[PDB]
Amino acid sequence: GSDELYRQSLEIISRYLREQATGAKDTKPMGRSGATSRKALETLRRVGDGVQRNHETAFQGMLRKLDIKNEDDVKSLSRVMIHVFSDGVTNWGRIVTLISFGAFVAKHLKTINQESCIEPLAESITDVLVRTKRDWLVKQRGWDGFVEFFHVEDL
């Protein structure tokens, strides 16, 4: 057996956070369910880049409040993400906003240290989403439902 939903989620989230932090796209192709993962990653680029641009002042404010000191300093962010969902509401708008702020934190990490790693961050986001909303994600057909919910044109 295996946890393919976790694997696929971490790959999409890690890829987006890495390319956002480094400014360079990763060329090696994706693994299992590459079609969905590619479209999902493209959807995240289109939507998530817009969320960051359109809320950049609020995002900077949030960064200031969290005062993230290094690549391992993600416990408060984890608590925030759990808190976001603690009213019992789950939807793709909330999820893409958390991933978008993740990419914003990733760029921040690079400003304070060029050698900063993004894996601790991507894992903390992936953990909240996949572990605490596993069955919701499955019911929505995972990243296919993500692609379909935003239905970006000319992917």
Partner: peptide, 23 residues
């Protein structure tokens, strides 16, 4: 932590805004 709740409330508000727009 009071700051963590303010951040969560802000992310939730943005997230609902995006969800209402595509709903």
């Amino acid at each position: 932590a009071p700051k963590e709740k303010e951040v969560a409330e802000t992310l939730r508000k943005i997230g609902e805004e995006i969800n209402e727009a595509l709903k």
